[PDB]
Design a protein around this ligand. Structure first.
Ligand code: GTP
Ligand code: ACP
Ligand code: GDP
Ligand code: CA
Ligand code: CA
Ligand code: CA
Ligand code: MG
Ligand code: MG
Ligand code: MG
Lengths: 423, 438, 54, 342
């Protein structure tokens, strides 16, 4: 009964978090009303990791929905699986955050955080053995970014010995709402560097390119982008939701994936990505799984080196042939795996495939090439900060330029830290 | 009669222990409900099998075993397994959160909180012993509980049972089935703090068991159930002398006397033969010489290494089945004139032979076929140091960058214990080279 | 090639064939190490809470 | 796409093998410390055999036989020949040798002196030679006192072949170097091409220039270097013609039959100790046998080198043969040897 408490904050965090519960609820046989109608006991084997069991055999997601605006959360409550969430777990304000990290972290968010922690405390007090927390949010907005990192800091203060895991959507000018997104992302990244154990870097730039280049979507929407995030989030959590021995919980995952405390930002990958009835062989899954075009972080793996790798194959396939293909990738491209961490590639298999696929593969990599993502944000940050552009939105909320200077230096240090292990 | 207490720590220890105690009952004719029809002394007795089984007034034969795991899932299997009636609740100890493959978490953080409970449960079984010999400790090297908590238990046992012997059955880490990258760390950490507390340890490299299953059993992708069925066979061959009438290795003390002339060098190499696939309708039964000769093929050893390029300090042949001394000597003489068997000068060049007439038992429906005769060789070769070299090399690669060290320091362990444990392995490797090299 | 110490019984027999002659810490100390480690954890957590307090 | 690592930068032979493998486009060289390799061109000293054959999904091959030092050491070879029944102390193609440890440290001092006095009393030739494996330091003397006193200042003392076959014109000494390759299957392949490292100085049975046929000694202390043959290296074609024109015989009958016999006997002797037939990794190795031929056309074994070099003209042909039979046989891609059956 290693329970995980889920939190989704802001527009992006709730829209993506909603699709996540919609996807995994389908894999476990849970309908929109919380009733189980599956046909395999493997669906309920570890259902309590993400679901609570109430009266009447109902399964209630252990999720907390947070936002400073009611807009997106009203859509969730009206969405497909909106009725499955616990009504008390909807914690929202009315002022909004105006895509302003300061508002979410210091002013508006501060006024609402204590009531969110009351819900978290209620959910944790019933857990037999709490693994930790997983947060879904974007770094470019105000609520998910600003209040999201505030919650993480306060959650760590109250549960210091629990694992903190996040799915963090990185902003990109290709899919941009406001020009201050680099500011909000830089401020958040430093919070994540200190207060999370595992962060899946989901780059909206990569999601857009995959929809456009690969999936052949000329005009991708947030719905199209969230389809890739749903499939990826489902893949990376397979080892936590189904019986297994590799990375079966959050702490053991962190022990295998994080050789250094601050280098805990992962590149997720998914295969296949079809734009559809053809059967995909095991060698094909492996090639696509490691292909840059299937990475969700918009970083070139060949530009860096792999510190650790977690692979998850789903479906009825030859586990013998899986071992062969995985060993063939490492043995044929061993120059991209650091030689000072022996056997840094672990492979897990799950019999239950995702909805609509005979089999799939999910890639989780801790590569030094992720620095390209932080350099990108750092360059966009500096382009504006050097002229103090748009700072008044933040100084008006009490912030000082010094705090920006420190966030800039913190991420440039993070980039330097990745660079030393790449050589 | 002198009792022996078995202690199973961590997943590997529990699951392996579950396989052995299953095989013990089949060999001694004990049913899953604990009854033993052949036992005419109801409620007691000082027979050979009583060294491992206690007897209740109702005739139940209870294993003298304790299961410990910082997670409840694995031991819950035994609570509801086929032989759930053999054990009582006091024998099964479980926590809620495991060591997360972190030696420091198993030894310091979580271990410190349950060590007194485990000892109290061990004391209960010890109080049922009129003459306790010692303990047999099953555990893995790579797991956080198998490595971290075992070393703490081995320390306390030496303090509470100073005069008792302690033997290990240790699972050496192999990437083909390993579940953590830091297993080399845990292996070296646990070997350092356990070395002075173990009188004799039988290492089993999962790599060797894995290939034997794929090669000799035609298992394409062996599982833990396949590996443990084979491991319990070797364990049974090793402990058979303690559970049956005989004159070789009659007590735990005799294992050290016959296999360990130097205390630190207490890691005998085990070689088993024959391993035949039960999927073969008919198989030519191997002779005494053929199975004995097979004891010098690296492909049948529990640890892949080349004994030809080392020296022997002792060698025991444990036969089970249709075997007579005349055939053993005829096979030994032939093997001397064909094999490279080099002993150390300060040791005799010979073999201690033990023969049990009851042939090996095979779990019904398993993978191993029934055989007329089988042998397990226990040889203290310096060649087994190759396993230490491999382990120490992987340790050096990661520790040079301090990779993953923060997980251990965060549990309260000091970084100095890494280099301290590594320096001990460095000395251990040096001891092997002085003995087996010129 | 010599055989010595031959013992026979109903369940088997044992012997020895020779081919050639030759040519701990106390409970107090353990408690100290365990408490010393727990003290370093408490110190590390106190610094974190101190950091979060700032 | 096979992988290999290079751990001996001073190997002229395998520097060419590594160059050929890359030229095939199907081999990729990795870092010397990368464990995911198919082939290891290992170092000469302390090659970590214990770490080989433990890579799931990788067939690993190394260019050295673990345990072959017993044959490629001065003191080891003497002990192996005397103590091995396959070779026996009555070996007829190996000079009478003895292992003599320096007094500042089993030993065969008394045994050596016994055979020495027998020759002195019997009027027979009593000239011996002292040498060791730590040489560039060799001493040739007919007095046992000088030999033992020199070692003290581990060596081996063997009978000095006082009646060596002398090439004409020149009246000079020489030695025969044969390259033998043993693959993972323990096939013994003898390179068809040999070389005679001849002395450019006339032989005098009374100065080590005309007695030592080393290529470095002839090119440094000899004043006739390269007079008769280029680089004091005579290949089999010329040597065979000389045997026919002078002695009315051939290299195959008079010498090569004995060389092939000696190669087999040595390698077949240690096969049970070094074979990798049922081992988790495979080994091959190139050997360099050195022979001496007396005036009676009898071949004598001098030593066996485990890391030998090759003649300049024969590097290409031999190195290609190494890739064909020793490397490509285990890792196929997309005869200059003589197989000594046994
Ligand atoms: N032969 C064999 N090896 C096993 C078995 N179970 C686990 N292992 C090995 O043990 C190592 C991991 O140690 P575990 O015993 O699983 O971990 P643990 O002792 O439960 O400690 P925790 O980290 O707290 O879970 C891996 O290298 C596995 O290959 C088993 O049933 N049989
Ligand atoms: N017993 C012997 N009788 C005659 N000549 C001998 C001899 N032992 C050694 N020599 C001479 O000494 C030379 C070199 O001896 P040895 O082979 O031991 O030197 P080395 O090992 O330094 C050269 P390499 O390693 O290239 O063969 C031989 O080529 C031969 O001329
Ligand atoms: N992938 C994805 N990204 C989103 C979505 N909604 C917003 N974003 C991104 O998130 C950033 C805006 O943050 P937002 O979540 O709207 O701010 P918040 O509601 O105040 O926390 C921009 O960089 C957007 O590109 C979504 O549904 N999916
Ligand atoms: Ca207010
Ligand atoms: Ca009884
Ligand atoms: Ca002791
Ligand atoms: Mg928005
Ligand atoms: Mg466990
Ligand atoms: Mg030589």
């Amino acid at each position: 009964m290693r329970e995980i408490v889920h939190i989704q904050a802001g527009q992006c965090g709730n829209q993506i978090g909603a699709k996540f519960w919609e996807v995994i609820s389908d894999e476990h046989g849970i309908d929109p009303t919380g009733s189980y109608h599956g046909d395999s006991d493997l669906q309920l084997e570890r259902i309590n990791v993400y679901y609570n069991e109430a009266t009447g055999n109902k399964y209630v997601p252990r999720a907390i929905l947070v936002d400073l605006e009611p807009g997106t959360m009203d859509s969730v409550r009206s969405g497909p699986f909106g009725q499955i969430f616990r009504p008390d777990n909807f914690v929202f304000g009315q002022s909004g955050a105006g895509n302003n990290w300061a508002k979410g972290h210091y002013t508006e968010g501060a006024e609402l955080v204590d009531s969110v922690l009351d819900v978290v405390r209620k959910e944790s007090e019933s857990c037999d053995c709490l693994q930790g927390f997983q947060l879904t949010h974007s770094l470019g907005g105000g609520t998910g970014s600003g209040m999201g990192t505030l919650l993480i800091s306060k959650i760590r203060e109250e549960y210091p010995d629990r694992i903190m895991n996040t799915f963090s959507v990185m902003p990109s000018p290709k899919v941009s709402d406001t020009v201050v997104e680099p500011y909000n992302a830089t401020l958040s990244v430093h919070q994540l560097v200190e207060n999370t154990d595992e962060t899946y870097c989901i780059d909206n730039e990569a999601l857009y390119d995959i929809c456009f280049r690969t999936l052949k979507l000329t005009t991708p929407t947030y719905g199209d982008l969230n389809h890739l995030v749903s499939a990826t989030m489902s893949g990376v959590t397979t080892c936590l939701r189904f019986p297994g021995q590799l990375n079966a919980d959050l702490r053991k995952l962190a022990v295998n994936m994080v050789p250094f405390p601050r280098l805990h930002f992962f590149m997720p990958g998914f295969a296949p990505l079809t734009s559809q009835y053809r059967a995909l062989t095991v060698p094909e899954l492996t090639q696509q799984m490691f292909d840059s075009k299937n990475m969700m972080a918009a970083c070139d793996p060949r530009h860096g080196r792999y510190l650790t790798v977690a692979a998850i194959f789903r479906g009825r396939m030859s586990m013998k042939e899986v071992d062969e293909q995985m060993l063939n990738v490492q043995n044929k491209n061993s120059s991209y795996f650091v030689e000072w961490i022996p056997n840094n590639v672990k492979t897990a298999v799950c019999d239950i495939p995702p909805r609509g696929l005979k089999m799939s593969a999910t890639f989780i990599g801790n590569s030094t090439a992720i620095q390209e993502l932080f350099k990108r944000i750092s360059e966009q940050f500096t382009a504006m900060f050097r002229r103090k552009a748009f700072l008044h939105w933040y100084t008006g909320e009490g912030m000082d330029e010094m705090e920006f200077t420190e966030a800039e230096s913190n991420m440039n240090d993070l980039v330097s830290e990745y660079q030393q292990y790449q050589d | 009669m002198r009792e022996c207490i078995s202690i199973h720590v961590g997943q590997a220890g529990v699951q392996i222990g579950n396989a052995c105690w299953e095989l013990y009952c089949l060999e001694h004719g004990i049913q899953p409900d604990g009854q033993m029809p052949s036992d005419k002394t109801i409620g007691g007795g000082d027979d050979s099998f009583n060294t491992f089984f206690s007897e209740t007034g109702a005739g139940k034969h209870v294993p003298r075993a304790v299961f410990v795991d910082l997670e409840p899932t694995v031991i819950d299997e035994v609570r509801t397994g086929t032989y759930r009636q053999l054990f009582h609740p006091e024998q099964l100890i479980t926590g809620k959160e495991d060591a997360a493959n972190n030696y420091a978490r198993g030894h310091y953080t979580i271990g410190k909180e349950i060590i007194d409970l485990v000892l109290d449960r061990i004391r209960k079984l010890a109080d049922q012993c009129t003459g306790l010999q010692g303990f047999l400790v099953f555990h893995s090297f790579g797991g956080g509980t198998g490595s971290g908590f075992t070393s703490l238990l081995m320390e306390r046992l030496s303090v509470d049972y100073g005069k008792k012997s302690k033997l290990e059955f240790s699972i050496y880490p192999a990437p083909q089935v390993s579940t953590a990258v830091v297993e080399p760390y845990n292996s070296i950490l646990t070997t350092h703090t356990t070395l002075e507390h173990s009188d004799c340890a039988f290492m089993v490299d999962n790599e060797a068991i894995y290939d034997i299953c794929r090669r000799n059993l035609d298992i394409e992708r062996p599982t833990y159930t396949n590996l443990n069925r084979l491991i319990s066979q070797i364990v049974s061959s090793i402990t058979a002398s303690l559970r049956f009438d005989g004159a070789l290795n009659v007590d735990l003390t005799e294992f050290q006397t016959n296999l360990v002339p130097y205390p630190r060098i207490h890691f005998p190499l085990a070689t088993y033969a024959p391993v035949i696939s039960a999927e073969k309708a008919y198989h030519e039964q191997l002779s005494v010489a053929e199975i004995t000769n097979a004891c010098f093929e690296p492909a049948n050893q529990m640890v892949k290494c080349d004994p030809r390029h080392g020296k022997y300090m002792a060698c025991c042949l444990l036969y089970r089945g249709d075997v007579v001394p005349k055939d053993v000597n005829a096979a030994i003489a032939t093997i001397k004139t064909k094999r490279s068997i080099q002993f150390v000068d300060w040791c005799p060049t010979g073999f201690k032979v033990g023969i049990n007439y009851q042939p090996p038992t095979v779990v019904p429906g398993g993978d191993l076929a029934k055989v007329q005769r089988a042998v397990c060789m226990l040889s203290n070769t310096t060649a087994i140091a190759e396993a230490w070299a491999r382990l120490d090399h992987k340790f050096d690669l990661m520790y040079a960058k301090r990779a993953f060290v923060h997980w251990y320091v965060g549990e309260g362990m000091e970084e100095g214990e890494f280099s301290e444990a590594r320096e001990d392995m460095a000395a251990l490797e040096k001891d092997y080279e002085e003995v087996g090299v010129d | 090639m010599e055989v010595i110490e031959l013992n026979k019984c109903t369940s088997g027999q044992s012997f020895e064939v020779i081919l050639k002659p030759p040519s701990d810490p106390s409970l107090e100390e353990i408690q100290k190490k365990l408490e010393a480690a727990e003290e370093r954890r408490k110190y590390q957590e106190a610094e974190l809470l101190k950091h979060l307090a700032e | 796409m096979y992988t290999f690592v290079v751990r001996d930068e001073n190997s002229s032979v395998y520097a060419e093998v590594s160059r050929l493998l890359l030229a095939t486009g199907q081999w990729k060289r990795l870092r010397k410390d990368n464990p995911r390799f198919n082939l290891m061109l290992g170092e000469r000293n302390r090659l970590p055999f214990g770490r080989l054959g433990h890579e799931p999904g990788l067939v690993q091959l190394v260019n050295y036989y673990r345990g072959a030092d017993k044959l490629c050491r001065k003191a080891s070879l003497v002990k192996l020949i005397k103590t091995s029944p396959e070779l026996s102390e009555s070996c007829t193609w190996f000079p009478e040798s003895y292992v003599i440890y320096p007094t500042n440290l089993t030993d065969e001092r008394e045994v050596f002196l016994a055979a020495y006095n027998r020759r002195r009393e019997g009027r027979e030739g009593n000239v011996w030679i002292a040498k060791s494996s730590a040489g560039a330091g060799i001493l040739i003397s007919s007095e046992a006192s000088e030999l033992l006193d020199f070692i003290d200042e581990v060596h081996v003392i063997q009978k000095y072949l006082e009646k060596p076959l002398l090439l004409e014109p020149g009246h000079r000494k020489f030695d025969i170097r044969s390259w033998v390759l043993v693959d993972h299957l323990y096939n013994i392949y003898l390179y068809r091409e040999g070389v005679l490292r001849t002395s450019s100085e006339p032989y005098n049975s009374a100065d080590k220039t005309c007695h030592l046929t080393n290529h470095c000694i002839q090119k440094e202390y000899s004043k006739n270097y390269g007079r008769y043959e280029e680089g004091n290296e005579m290949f089999f074609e010329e040597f065979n013609q000389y045997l026919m024109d002078a002695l009315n015989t051939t290299l195959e009958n008079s010498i090569l039959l004995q060389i092939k016999h000696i190669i087999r006997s040595c390698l077949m002797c240690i096969e049970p100790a070094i074979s990798t037939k049922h081992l988790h990794y495979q080994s091959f190795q190139l050997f360099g046998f050195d022979f001496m031929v007396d005036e009676e056309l009898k071949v004598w074994l001098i030593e066996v080198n485990g890391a030998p070099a090759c003649a300049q003209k024969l590097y290409a042909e031999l190195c290609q043969g190494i890739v064909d039979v020793a490397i490509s046989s285990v890792f196929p891609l997309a005869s200059i040897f003589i197989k000594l059956h046994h």
